[PDB]
Design a protein around this ligand. Structure first.
Ligand SMILES: [Zn+2]
Length: 179
């Protein structure tokens, strides 16, 4: 697919207020793979769109109040059916990695894009999502070369704390489709 220098045309743009300047406007290299579903264990709700914009309703669900204290966002999301939703231009800083670390260098937000796979640590992602994740990845690799040589889980840059994208994530399947 195609890149309007930050934005994915194919997608459904959610204008998240939750971005800012990459420090010294450094360009991204490492892509991190995230997972998420809300409420935790269901798919298709509007609620992800919600969390990612800082508007989600703490009253919509006993699990939504537990996190209604965050302001967080991830560059793009892949829904179970392949649909790509984009909240923030790739060149900008997403509030996704958190307290993370990759190769001596923390605050991994700075230099990374974050892709969310709708799902759970323990349930297989769908064919469409492997096709889509790889699709987006090839694009960013073309814009940002280093990505092909920096790809990881949240669980890698934040062990113990994070386990996403989980043992479900079959890197084999995905890589099989990256350039
Ligand atoms: Zn994550």
């Amino acid at each position: 697919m195609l890149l309007d220098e930050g934005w994915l045309a194919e997608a459904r743009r959610v204008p998240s207020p939750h971005y800012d300047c990459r420090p010294d406007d450094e360009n991204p290299s490492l892509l991190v793979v995230h997972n998420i579903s809300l409420p935790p264990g269901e798919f298709g709700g509007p609620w992800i769109d919600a969390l990612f914009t800082g508007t989600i309703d703490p009253n919509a669900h006993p699990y939504f109040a537990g996190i209604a204290h965050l302001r967080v966002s991830a560059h793009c999301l892949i829904r179970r059916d392949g649909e790509i939703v984009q909240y923030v231009p790739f060149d900008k800083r997403a509030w996704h990695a958190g307290v993370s670390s990759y190769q001596g260098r923390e605050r991994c937000n700075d230099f990374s894009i974050g892709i969310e796979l709708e799902g759970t640590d323990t349930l297989a992602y769908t064919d469409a999502q492997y096709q889509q994740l790889a699709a987006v990845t090839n694009a960013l690799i073309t814009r940002y070369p280093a990505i092909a040589n920096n790809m990881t889980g949240h669980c890698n840059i934040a062990p113990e704390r994070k386990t996403d994208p989980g043992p479900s994530f079959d890197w084999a399947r995905f890589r099989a489709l990256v350039t």
